[PDB]
Structures are given as C-alpha cells and as structure tokens.
Amino acid sequence: PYLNLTPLNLIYTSGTFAPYDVFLEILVKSRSNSFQTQAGRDTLREQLINSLQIVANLNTRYPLLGFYVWVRNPTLAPVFEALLRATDTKNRIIEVEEESRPTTAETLNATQRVDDATVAIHKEIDNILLLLQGGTAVYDRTAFEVASGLSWADPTTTSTTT
Amino acid sequence: PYLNLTPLNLIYTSGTFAPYDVFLEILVKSRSNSFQTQAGRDTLREQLINSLQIVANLNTRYPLLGFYVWVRNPTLAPVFEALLRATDTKNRIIEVEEESRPTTAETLNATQRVDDATVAIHKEIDNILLLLQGGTAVYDRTAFEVASGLSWADPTTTSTTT
Amino acid sequence: PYLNLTPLNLIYTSGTFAPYDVFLEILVKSRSNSFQTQAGRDTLREQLINSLQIVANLNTRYPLLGFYVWVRNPTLAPVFEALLRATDTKNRIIEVEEESRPTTAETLNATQRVDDATVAIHKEIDNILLLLQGGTAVYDRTAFEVASGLSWADPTTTSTTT
Amino acid sequence: PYLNLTPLNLIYTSGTFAPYDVFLEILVKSRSNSFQTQAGRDTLREQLINSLQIVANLNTRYPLLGFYVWVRNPTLAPVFEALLRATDTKNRIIEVEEESRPTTAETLNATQRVDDATVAIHKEIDNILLLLQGGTAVYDRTAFEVASGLSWADPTTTSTTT
Amino acid sequence: PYLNLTPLNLIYTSGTFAPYDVFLEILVKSRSNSFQTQAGRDTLREQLINSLQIVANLNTRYPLLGFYVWVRNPTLAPVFEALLRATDTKNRIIEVEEESRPTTAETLNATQRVDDATVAIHKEIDNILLLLQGGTAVYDRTAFEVASGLSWADPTTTSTTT
Amino acid sequence: PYLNLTPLNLIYTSGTFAPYDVFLEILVKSRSNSFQTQAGRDTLREQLINSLQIVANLNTRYPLLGFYVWVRNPTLAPVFEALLRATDTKNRIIEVEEESRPTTAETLNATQRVDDATVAIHKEIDNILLLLQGGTAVYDRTAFEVASGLSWADPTTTSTTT
Amino acid sequence: PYLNLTPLNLIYTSGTFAPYDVFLEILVKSRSNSFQTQAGRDTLREQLINSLQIVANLNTRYPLLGFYVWVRNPTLAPVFEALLRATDTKNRIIEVEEESRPTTAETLNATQRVDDATVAIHKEIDNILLLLQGGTAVYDRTAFEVASGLSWADPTTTSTTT
Amino acid sequence: PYLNLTPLNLIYTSGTFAPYDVFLEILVKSRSNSFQTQAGRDTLREQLINSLQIVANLNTRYPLLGFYVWVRNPTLAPVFEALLRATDTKNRIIEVEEESRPTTAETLNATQRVDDATVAIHKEIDNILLLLQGGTAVYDRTAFEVASGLSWADPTTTSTTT
Amino acid sequence: PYLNLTPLNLIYTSGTFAPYDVFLEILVKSRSNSFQTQAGRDTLREQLINSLQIVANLNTRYPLLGFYVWVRNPTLAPVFEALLRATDTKNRIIEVEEESRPTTAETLNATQRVDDATVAIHKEIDNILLLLQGGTAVYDRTAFEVASGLSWADPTTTSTTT
Amino acid sequence: PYLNLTPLNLIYTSGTFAPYDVFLEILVKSRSNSFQTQAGRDTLREQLINSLQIVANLNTRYPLLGFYVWVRNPTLAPVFEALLRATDTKNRIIEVEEESRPTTAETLNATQRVDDATVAIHKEIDNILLLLQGGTAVYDRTAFEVASGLSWADPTTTSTTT
C-alpha cells in the first residue's frame, strides 16, 4: 500500500498531477484560434482540468515507466493557477437586440479592460510553455515518492521488488 | 465517551471540521468554469458547506485512520470564512426586458465594482490552496483531542485500548 | 438488519442514490435534441428523477457488486440539485391564435431571458458530466456503510459473512 | 400519561412534528416538474402539510423506535414556514378569452415579479434539503421529552419500564 | 471478464467511445449544406450521437484490430460536448401567417444573435476536425485498458492468450 | 411462485412491459402515413397500448428465452408516456356544413397550434426509436427479477432448476 | 374486532384505500384514447372511484396477503384529489344546430382555456404514475394498523394468532 | 441459427434494412413529378416503407451475395427518418365549394408555410442520395453480423461452411 | 493490404482526398454565374463535396498513375474548410407576399452584412485557386504512403512488385 | 526504440517540430492578401499549426534524409509563439444593421488600436522569415537526438546500423 505520511502528504498525492504532452501542445494548438470568443478562453479550462486528478493516491501508487507533470508547484503552480483566471472575465455584455444597444462603450463598462483581459490567455501559455519547456515538477515515479517523501508499503520483492 | 471539557471545547468539536481532498481539488476544478455567473460564485458555498459539519462530537469521537481538515483556524479560518463573502455580492441587476434597459452603467450601480468582486472567488482559492498545500489545521485524530485538549472517556483497553 | 444510526443517517440511506450509467450517457444523448422545447428541458427531470429513490434503506442493505452514484453531495449535490431548476422557467407564453399576438417581445416579458435560461440545461450537464467523469460520490457498498457510517446488523457469518 | 408541563410545552407537543423521508425526497422528486404551474407550486403545501400534525400529544406519547422531524425550529422553522409563502403569489391573471387580452405585460401587473416568485419554490427546497441533510430537529423519542422537557407519567416498569 | 476497477473506471468504459471515420467526414460532408435550417444544425446531433454508446463495457471487452475514438477527453471532450450546444438555439420564431408578422426584428428577439449562433456549427467542426486530425483519444484496444487502467479477466491463454 | 416482494415490486411486475419489435418498426412504418388525420395520431395509441400488459406477474414468472421491452423507465418512461399525449389534441373543429363555416382561423381557435401539435407524433417516435435503438430497459428474464429485485419461489431443481 | 381508536382513526380506516394495479395500468391504457371527449375525461372518475371504498373498516380488518394503495396521502392525496378536477371543466358549449352557431370563439367563452384544461388529465396521470411507481402509501396490512395506529382486537391465537 | 446476442442486437436485426437500388432511383424518378400534390409527398412513404422490414432476423440469417442498405444509422438514420416528416404536413384545407371559400390566405392558416413544407421532400432526397451515393450503412453480409456483432450458429461446415 | 499504422494514419487515409481538375476549373467556371443566389453559393458545396471521399483506404491502396489533391492541409485545409462556410449565411428573409413586406432593411436584419457575405464565395476560390495553382498537397501515390507514413502490405513482387 | 531520457526530453520530442518549406513560402504567399480581414489574420494559425505535431516521438524516431524545423527555440520560439497572438485581437465589433451604427470610433473602442494590431501579422513573418532564412533550429536527424540528447535504442546494425 503506497502511503500518505502525516500533515505533509495529503497534498501531493492528489490533483497536483495527471499528464505530460497534453496541455504542452494543448498550449500551442490552443492558440490555433482566438482567446477572446466565449469559445477560446472559457472552453480551455477543462481541456486542462480534464488533466489534473486523483492519480497516484494512497490505496494505489505512482507510475513505473509513467513519469508525469505537477500542479502545486513554486515554478508552475502560480502560473497554472494563474492562467485559468484571466480567460474568463471578458464580459457577458452584448447589449444587442434588433439594433444593438449602441452604448457598450458610450457609457457603461470599462470596455477597454476587455482588450486588457483579451490577452492574459494568449499569455500565461508560454510562461508555462517555458517553465515546463525545461523539466519542472515532472518525474518518473522514483522522484514522486521522493520529492514528496510519501513512503510505499508492501514487500512485492518476489516477482515485483520493493 | 469522548468528551467536551469546559468553556474551551464547545467550539472545535463541532463544525470546525469534516473532510480533506474535497475542496482541495474542489478549488482547482471549480475554477474549471467562471465565477462571475450566478452559477459559479453562488453555487460554490455548499459544495464546501456540504464539507464542515458535526463530526467528532461528544457522544462519539475523532477518527483512527481518519485524519482531516479544520475551519476555525488562525491560518485557515480568516481565508475560509473570507472567500464565502465575495462570491455573492456581484449584483442581481439585469435591467433587461424586450430591449434591455440600457442604463446599467449609464446611471445606476457602481458597475465596475462587479468587475472588482468578480475575482475575489478566483482569488481566496489559492491563498487556502496554499496555506492548506502545507499541512495546516489537519490531523490524524491523536492531534485533535490534543490541539483542542478534549479528553476521551471509556476504558476500551481489552480489544480497543485507551 | 442494515441500520440507520442516529440524527446522522436518516439522510444518506434514502434518495441520495440509485444508479450509474443512466444519466451519464443520459447527459450526452439527452443533448441529442434541444433543451428549449417543452419537450427537451421539462421531460428531462424524471429520466433522472426515475434514478434517485429509496434503495439501500434500513430494513434491507447496500449492494455487494452493486456500486452506484450519489445525490446529496458537496461536489454533486449543488450541481444535481442545480440543473433541475433552469430547464423549467423558459415561459408558458405563446400569444398565438389565428394570427399570433405579435406582442411577445414588443411589450411584455423579458423575452431575452428565455435566451438566457435556454442554455442552463445544455450547461449543468458537463459540470456533472465532469465532476462525475472522475469517481465522485460513487462507491461499491463497503464505502456506503462507511462514508455515512451506518452500521449493518445480522451475523450472516455461516454462508453469508459479516 | 406523557405530559404537557407549563407555559412551555403547549407548543412542541403539537404540530411541530410528524415524519422523516416524506418531504426529503418530496423535495427532490417534487422538482420533477415545474413550480410555475398552478399545479407545481400550489399543490405542494399539503403533500408537506399532510406531514405535520398532532402526533406525540399529552394523552399519548413520543415513539420508541419512532424518531422524526420538527417544524417550530431555529434552523428549520424559518425555512419551512418560509417556502410555503412563495409558491403561491404568482398570479391569477390569464387575461385570455377567444383572443387572449394581450395587455398582461403591456400595462397591468409587475409581470416580471412572477419571474421573480417563479423560483422561490425551486429554492427553499435545498436550504432545508441541506439544513435537514444534517440531522436537525430530528430525534428518536428520548430527545423529544428532553429537547422540550415534557415529562412522561405512568410507571409501566413491570413489562414496559419508566 | 474484462473489468471495471473502482471509483475510476465507471466512466471510460461507457459512452466515452464508439467509432472513427464516422463524424470525421461527417464533419466535412455535413458542411455540404447549411447549418442555419432546422434541418442542418438540429438533425446533426444523432448522426454523431448514433456514434457514442456502451461499447467495450465490463461484461464484454475492447477491440483487437478495433481501434476507435473517444469523447470524455481534455482535447476533445470540451469541443465535442461544445458543438452540440450551438447548433440548437437559433430560434423557433417564424411570425408568419398569410402576411408574415413583419415584427421579427422590428421589436422582439435579439435577431442578430441568430446570425451569431448561425456559425457555431460551421465552427466547432474544424477545432475537432483538427484536434482529431492528429490521433487524439483514439487507440487500438491495448491502450484502452491502459489509458483507463481497467484490467481484463479470463485466462484465454490456450487458443486466445491473456 | 415467482414473487412480488414489498412496497417496491408492485410496479415493475405489471404493465411496465410486454414486447420488442412491435412498436420498433411500428414507429418507422407508422410514419408510412400522416399523423395529422384522426386516423394517424389517434389510432396509434392501441397499436402500442396493445403492447404493455400484465405479463410476468406474481402467480406466473418472466421469460426463459423471452427477453423484452420496458415502460416505467428513466430513459423510456418519460418519452413513452410523452408521445401518447401530443397525438390527440389537434382539434375536433371542422366547422363545415354545405358551405364550410369559413371562420376556423378567421376568429376562433389558436389554429396554428394544430400545426404545432401536428408534429409531436412524428417526433417522440425517434427519441425512443433511438433511446431504444440502444438496448434500454430491455432484458432476457434473469435481469428482470434482478433490475427489480423480485425473488422467484419454487425449487424446480429436478427437471426445471432454480 | 379490528378497531378505530380516537379522533385519529376515523379517517384512514375508510376510503383512503381499495386496490393496486387497477388505476396503475388504468393510467397508461386510459391514455389509449383522448381526454378531450366527454368520453375520455369525464368517464375516468369512476373507473378510479370504483377503486376507493370502505374496505378494512372497524367491524372487519386489513388484508393478510392483501396489501394495497392509499388515497388521503402527503405524496398521493394532493395528486389523486387533484386530477379528478381538471378532466371535467372543458365546456358543455357546442353551439351547433343545422348550421353550427359559428360564435364559439368569435365572442363568447375563453375558448383556448379548453385547450389549457385539455391536458390536465393527460397530466396528473404520470405525477402519480411516478409517485406510485415507487411504493408510496401502499402496504401489506401489518403497516396499515401501524401507519394509522388502529389497534386490532380479538385473541385468535389458537388457529389464527394475534 | 443466426443469433440475436443481448441488449444490443434486438435492433439491427430487424427493420434497419431491406434493399439497395429501390429508393436510390426511387429518389431521382420520384422527383419526376411534384411533391406538393396529395399524390407526390404522401404516397412516397410506402414506396420506401415497402423497403425496410424484418429481413435477416434470428431464426434465419444475412445474405451471401445479398448485400443491402441500412436505416438506423448515424449518417442515414436522421435523414431517412427525417424526410418522411416533411412530405405530410402541407394542409388538408381546400376551402372550396361551388365558389371556393376565398379566405385561405386572407385570414386563416400560415399559408406560406405550405410553400416552406413544399420543398422538404424535394430536399432530404439528395442529402441521402449523397450520403448513400458513397457506400454508407450498406454491406454484403459478412459485415452485418460484424457491424452489429450478432453471432450466427450452426456448423454447416460440410457442404455449407461456418 | 495497404495499411493504417497507429494513432496517426486514421486521418489521411480517409476523405483528405479524391480528385484534381474537378474544383480547379470548378472554381473558374463556377464564377460563371453569381454567388448571391440560393443557386450559386449553396449548390457549390457538393459539386466539391462530391470530390472528397474514402478513396485510398486500408483494405485497398493509393493510385499508380493516379496522383491527386488533398484536404486536411496546412496550406489548403484552412481555405478549403473556410470557403464552405461563407457561401451559406446570406439570409432566408424575403419578406415578400402580394406586396413585398418593405421592412427588410427598414428595421430588421443587418442587411448590409449580406453584401459582406456576398463575396466570401467569389473570394476563397482564388486563395485556393492559387495555393493549389502551385502543387500543394497533391501527389502521385509514392508520396501518399510517404507524407502520411502508412505502410502498404502484400509482396506482389512477381508480376506486381513491392 | 528511440528514447525520451529524463526531466529533459519530454519537451523536444513532441511538437517542437514538423516541417520546412511549409510556412516559409507560407509566410511570403500568405502576405498575398491582407491580414486585417477575419480571413487573413485568423485563418493563418492552422495553416502553420497544421505544421507542428507529435513527429519523432519515443515509440518511433527522427528522419534519415528527413531534416526539419523547430518551435521551442531561443531564436524562433519567442517569434513563432509571438506572431500567433497579434493576428487575432482586431475586434469583433461591426456595429452595423440596416444603417451601420455609426458610433464605432465616435465613442466606444480604442479603434485606432486595430490599426496598431493590423500589422503585427504582416510583421512577425519576416523576423522569422529571416531568423529561419539562416538555418536555425533546423537539422537532419543526427543533430535532433544530439541537440536534445535523447538516445535511440535498438541494434539494427545488420541491415539498418546503430
């Protein structure tokens, strides 16, 4: 039984991980569009939140030839956790009708701040395309149990050593 | 009978606790959306208030291999108790109709302050994603009775020691 | 006699459960239509309320090889309980006749708010298609009695152990 | 003779109670419809007022293995007593005929306020689906006589102890 | 008996799959029309929902030389699940008669927003024509049991190895 | 004596069933006409209500090689039970005579709403042609007693095992 | 002598009951027609009022292997008691003659409200087809005397125990 | 005995098939007329519903050199099943007499919507003339048992191999 | 047996191809008209979608002296896939009658945007008339198996070498 | 088996590559238009994102006579990754109608900033037309395994040396 130590373990054991090449290219070919559109920005999330879940938990273990990426991270974490938040604030206001209510930027929102939050998607992609472009967080399995400390139990020595 | 001492105990015995991995990921995959929408912000609460209830009370006890998180907390408490409040003030005003009443931000609310309270959800998630990313409040059971002081009664020594 | 403990048990014992793969696909192939139509939105309910009933009660028990889903839930509950409510508010007004009363959106309702509540069906489907896309609430049987605490009675040890 | 003490007792002895699982699911499978319709909202009442009557009175008593729910309650009461009132104000005006009088929302009521009172049914269901989702008011019998104080009379000690 | 592991398996075992070349061309030769028409947009669904069903379940298995596509997916899922929703909101209003009620876009809907939702069909087709244009989700069989983890049972070693 | 358990059994034992291929094609070759005509819509019912009766009751049993369809169903039920109702509301008004009273849609009904209820027959046929196009409700016999739970009595072990 | 206790008993002892499978299918194969017609709606009543009479009274008792349904009910009652009333208000006006008086919906009733009360029959059938589709009110006999409390008299212990 | 497997088989075994070249040309030389006329549109059905029946069932098999077309289909199905419905809604109103009641489109139907449903026949013919113009659904026999999975029984190996 | 490799092959093997000189001139002599007309724009599609189908599949191969064009393409693809979409959005509104409803561009659509989408047909023709005017995607056969990688099987060396 | 070393390799093995002459000329003959138009700028992406995918992965290798370009690059990367982002921010605002809402640059956006983002497409093309005009990133195959370090496995020495 791979284990979950003490006050430090009940973190990086859970959704601090999941894949590798997913978001990687899913950061280059995700720019194959636009971020503005309730399509681009918004829909992003899950293509990447469909990639960070309870893998390598206690009643199981971390991957032989199954190295992977990490979330909760001093390199990554504040970039991961950062992007998410600027690809979803770019309005909901389309004062349209039969004749679009012309007053969007004639007396209402801070309109241009859309033009500001337009890019924060385009952006955080390469900060992490790069931080991650150099082996950060990532590791085989041997380094999981290690860079977290969580000790695996069960003497599988005869036909499956430990 | 696990007990509830004196003027100090009738606190951390009740809803100062409940789970672990719930809100954790329920803080990462909760950002898998938007917070703006009466959906995102509002609905949040209970997904996390459905996780802080009368567990480990007097006429019962605190978990063998059942460690967990804590609310009333000098790290957590003022972040826990803080988030809740900024994911629910972002209006109720949709002066719409057949032609939306155009005057939302043409003479009425402080409109932009929505854009201010937009984020306080996105936000308090990582303050606690982090404070909690390092074993705070959390503990096995042995540390509950301890970090609260509440003494358990009943000599289960023969077949269930204490 | 599987049992129903004390003030905590008379909840998750009753309609906090029922199936698995039902609504799952009944969330993908339910979008095989439209939600607008008094057909789509409305009729939905029961296809999913015909899936959450007094199973695993006191005078009975929870399933050997019969794992299943859960309702009252900090992940699920506020999404389950949420969808239901936006697939049934999209009018009743069809001011028609021999010549349709033209005044639907010429002086009457907030018409566009139909266009707003149009989607809340399409929507809540994937929040839970996802929350549920990762094993939440769900469990074999061993975890029911557990994640609720309700202790089963009757020493079936000889030919049906416990 | 179970009794009814003094100025405090002539309350929680009467219709402050009745069942358990009734309204519970009768809150989930009651949303299996719509609340708008003079059907949904209105008809609700009794399905739940057919569940709060003179049980456990003076010339009788409160249930051995017969625990149940409570009305007059600092958790429940103002939610119980609250719902009832917003599932019955959504008009009576259907200015119809052979040609519907088109003027419903062209010069008459506050029409949209129907759209406001539409939901207060959908709503109060989960506030109490939840408050009640955690053992509130509820209790075996031993706790009735207690959390009210009403002392039971008659020494049934030989074959029915007290 | 191919199996369905634990809280993670009761997902990608069911309608997370079905075919390959179906929708592929059914995305190019589906544009051989128009999407506007209650024909185009609407009828689409099933031509593609008639392609994602309980294949490779527990009491059966996943295809020898039978590789195929996948739904619940961090690349695909939020594009799959996305398209469906914008090919079905483009009205129901054809205020016609003997003389068409001229007021469609003279005082009523947000008319142009049809012109907005006109294209979301044309659209999501290539996002996935592309994401899928490069081997995503897809896999032989060997990779199913793998990229899900679900372990197959039954020693068919003599004449059907495993 | 196949049996009828307790408060749950006195349902799916009775007219929750009957055949298979009946309505199936009786849904494709039933469209071999028109639904409008007091012929089409109306006459439908029984061709399908002549297919859902007390089969597999208590004092009898459910079919060896006799698998079949089901009514009361979270997939089917609200589609089955749904169709029936829109193939029978399309008037009774044929203000005809020697000279047809011309005023049908000149000052009377909501005429066009016939044109609305014209199709609800054509319609619900494929929702269930499809839901049912993938093995739903249906099952051999072994799964009846199961997916309902109703336990069969009588040890026919010698020459007819159980 | 089965008995009829005190102010509570002179209710559920009388026509709060009668059968089971009657109306059940008599709700599915009752839709095998139309509800509009002075036939459908009206004639309904008794097919179901010929199923709720003085059975299980005082000078008699409630059924050994004779479980059955119930009327006065917080689930059922307000649905039972509800249907009855909307299958009988759909006119009496057939201003016909040799030439039908054309003025039915040219200056007279609220004509369309027939089209409104057309369906309330079709309707209340499934609310109760469902509430009842899950064992509500229903019970063997043991639960009658119980869920009402009415105590049976007469020591039939030798050859007919009690 | 060719067989009919389990919950998946009792579909594509029955009227999901029948011929080839029938409707094909019966789609080109069917346009050799007009669709408007109660002749054209209406009479169509059976010329094509006289081509989709219980062929290749269980107690029989699927054609050696007898390849053919298919109905229930993600390409075809929603086009097949689609056409049928728009070649039969184009009225029944011919307010004629000795002098035709002139009021057809002077105050009555939505007249032009006939001109709309005029073409839906002309139409769906080529969508499927094309989808089908490229080998879809169709197959020899070897591919039936396959693309459905239904396993044939009976070792005809000596003089009729399998 | 020409083959279909692994996750990369199940793309460019299918409708990524078909002809050469078809659309080429079918781009010059297709401008021999007008694009505006429900004729020009709309009808285009298939003249070119009747030119991109399952040719060179697995159980077959790619053309000796049979070179041809390609769809899924970094030059072509986003131009191919692009044109299709702007030759089909130019209305459906011809508010005509006996006197054309004059209000087309007097209060309704964005009329001029027709004049905008008028040309997108005329247009995308030369982008690809040109990209394609220089040998792009195109290739003999030797380059298919190559620029895709899909390896052909079967040693036809004696009388048909490989 | 060409390999994927350790924390450094799980980068330049994946979409850090694909072609050569593609974008090259696809940078000169891409300027054969305009960049402004939702055509030019937007559609660009994929013509170049249809050129950077999982080629030379682990379970495969890098090209004999198959040299090619690279993305993740200190020359290229921040130019590649840069262009993409300025060919997609140039509005969505065409406040047009029957009379174009004249207020585009009369009180609304920062209009001229379109004129600023007009060119960033025209631009980044030559920075990389040049950086790339001199052999950067590019290399045969021998230099891939090298300038990344990823060691290839499998002694193909006899008939395919290594």
Side-chain angles (χ1 to χ4, degrees), chain A residues 45 53 72 81 85 107, chain B residues 29 31 105 122 129 133:
Chain A
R45 48 173 108 135
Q53 20 55 359
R72 183 65 65 185
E81 314 182 19
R85 270 54 188 271
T107 26
Chain B
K29 293 179 179 179
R31 322 151 60 119
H122 302 65
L129 240 169
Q133 240 143 160

Side-chain angles (χ1 to χ4, degrees), chain J residues 22-109:
Chain J
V22 290
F23 26 51
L24 317 197
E25 276 108 303
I26 298 184
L27 290 163
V28 218
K29 293 179 179 179
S30 321
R31 322 151 60 119
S32 67
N33 287 98
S34 159
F35 305 71
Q36 312 202 241
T37 74
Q38 215 144 308
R41 42 202 300 241
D42 284 269
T43 350
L44 253 267
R45 48 173 108 135
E46 304 149 336
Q47 294 187 263
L48 312 175
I49 74 84
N50 266 317
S51 74
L52 62 319
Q53 20 55 359
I54 293 208
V55 241
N57 54 272
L58 202 170
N59 234 277
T60 38
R61 202 160 97 124
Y62 190 111
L64 199 293
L65 12 29
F67 35 135
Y68 53 77
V69 171
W70 274 262
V71 185
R72 183 65 65 185
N73 250 58
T75 334
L76 296 173
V79 181
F80 279 4
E81 314 182 19
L83 208 171
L84 272 23
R85 270 54 188 271
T87 78
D88 58 68
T89 43
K90 173 186 177 49
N91 254 151
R92 197 124 118 145
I93 276 67
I94 194 154
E95 253 179 81
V96 64
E97 174 234 340
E98 316 255 74
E99 273 49 72
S100 186
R101 212 70 35 58
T103 29
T104 301
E106 335 229 330
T107 26
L108 208 58
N109 334 254

Side-chain angles (χ1 to χ4, degrees), chain D residues 3-121:
Chain D
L3 308 130
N4 206 102
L5 301 176
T6 45
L8 316 311
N9 232 287
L10 291 295
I11 308 140
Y12 49 13
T13 17
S14 292
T16 311
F17 43 160
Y20 262 166
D21 45 21
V22 290
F23 26 51
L24 317 197
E25 276 108 303
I26 298 184
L27 290 163
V28 218
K29 293 179 179 179
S30 321
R31 322 151 60 119
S32 67
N33 287 98
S34 159
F35 305 71
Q36 312 202 241
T37 74
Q38 215 144 308
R41 42 202 300 241
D42 284 269
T43 350
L44 253 267
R45 48 173 108 135
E46 304 149 336
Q47 294 187 263
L48 312 175
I49 74 84
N50 266 317
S51 74
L52 62 319
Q53 20 55 359
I54 293 208
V55 241
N57 54 272
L58 202 170
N59 234 277
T60 38
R61 202 160 97 124
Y62 190 111
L64 199 293
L65 12 29
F67 35 135
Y68 53 77
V69 171
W70 274 262
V71 185
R72 183 65 65 185
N73 250 58
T75 334
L76 296 173
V79 181
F80 279 4
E81 314 182 19
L83 208 171
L84 272 23
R85 270 54 188 271
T87 78
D88 58 68
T89 43
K90 173 186 177 49
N91 254 151
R92 197 124 118 145
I93 276 68
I94 194 154
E95 253 179 81
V96 64
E97 174 234 340
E98 316 255 74
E99 273 49 72
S100 186
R101 212 70 35 58
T103 29
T104 301
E106 335 229 330
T107 26
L108 208 58
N109 334 254
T111 171
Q112 293 106 319
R113 63 74 28 174
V114 176
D115 318 45
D116 277 311
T118 305
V119 274
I121 318 79

Side-chain angles (χ1 to χ4, degrees), chain A residues 50-110:
Chain A
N50 266 317
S51 74
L52 62 319
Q53 20 55 359
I54 293 208
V55 241
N57 54 272
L58 202 170
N59 234 277
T60 38
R61 202 160 97 124
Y62 190 111
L64 199 293
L65 13 29
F67 35 135
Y68 53 77
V69 171
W70 274 262
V71 185
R72 183 65 65 185
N73 250 58
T75 334
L76 296 173
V79 181
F80 279 4
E81 314 182 19
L83 208 171
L84 272 23
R85 270 54 188 271
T87 78
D88 58 68
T89 43
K90 173 186 177 49
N91 254 151
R92 197 124 118 145
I93 276 67
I94 194 154
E95 253 179 81
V96 64
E97 174 234 340
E98 316 255 74
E99 273 49 72
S100 186
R101 212 70 35 58
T103 29
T104 301
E106 335 229 330
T107 26
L108 208 58
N109 334 254

Side-chain angles (χ1 to χ4, degrees), chain A:
Chain A
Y2 146 129
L3 308 130
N4 206 102
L5 301 176
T6 45
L8 316 311
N9 232 287
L10 291 295
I11 308 140
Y12 49 13
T13 17
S14 292
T16 311
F17 43 160
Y20 262 166
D21 45 21
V22 290
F23 26 51
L24 317 197
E25 276 108 303
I26 298 184
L27 290 163
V28 218
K29 293 179 179 179
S30 321
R31 322 151 60 119
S32 67
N33 287 98
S34 159
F35 305 71
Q36 312 202 241
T37 74
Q38 215 144 308
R41 42 202 300 241
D42 284 269
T43 350
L44 253 267
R45 48 173 108 135
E46 304 149 336
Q47 294 187 263
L48 312 175
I49 74 84
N50 266 317
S51 74
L52 62 319
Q53 20 55 359
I54 293 208
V55 241
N57 54 272
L58 202 170
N59 234 277
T60 38
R61 202 160 97 124
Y62 190 111
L64 199 293
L65 13 29
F67 35 135
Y68 53 77
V69 171
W70 274 262
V71 185
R72 183 65 65 185
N73 250 58
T75 334
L76 296 173
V79 181
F80 279 4
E81 314 182 19
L83 208 171
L84 272 23
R85 270 54 188 271
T87 78
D88 58 68
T89 43
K90 173 186 177 49
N91 254 151
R92 197 124 118 145
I93 276 67
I94 194 154
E95 253 179 81
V96 64
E97 174 234 340
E98 316 255 74
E99 273 49 72
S100 186
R101 212 70 35 58
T103 29
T104 301
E106 335 229 330
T107 26
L108 208 58
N109 334 254
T111 171
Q112 293 106 319
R113 63 74 28 174
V114 176
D115 318 45
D116 277 311
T118 305
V119 274
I121 318 79
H122 302 65
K123 276 64 172 300
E124 318 237 9
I125 277 197
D126 60 14
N127 300 2
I128 32 194
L129 240 169
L130 301 150
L131 292 127
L132 121 193
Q133 240 143 160
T136 312
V138 4
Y139 54 55
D140 282 67
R141 47 147 327 144
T142 42
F144 169 47
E145 332 261 296
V146 164
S148 59
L150 37 90
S151 340
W152 143 267
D154 224 73
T156 41
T157 280
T158 306
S159 287
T160 155
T161 321
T162 297

Side-chain angles (χ1 to χ4, degrees), chain F residues 118-159:
Chain F
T118 305
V119 274
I121 318 79
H122 302 65
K123 276 64 172 300
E124 318 237 9
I125 277 197
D126 60 14
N127 300 2
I128 32 194
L129 240 169
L130 301 150
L131 292 127
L132 121 193
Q133 240 143 160
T136 312
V138 4
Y139 54 55
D140 282 67
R141 47 147 327 144
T142 42
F144 169 47
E145 332 261 296
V146 164
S148 59
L150 37 90
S151 340
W152 143 267
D154 224 73
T156 41
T157 280
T158 306
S159 287

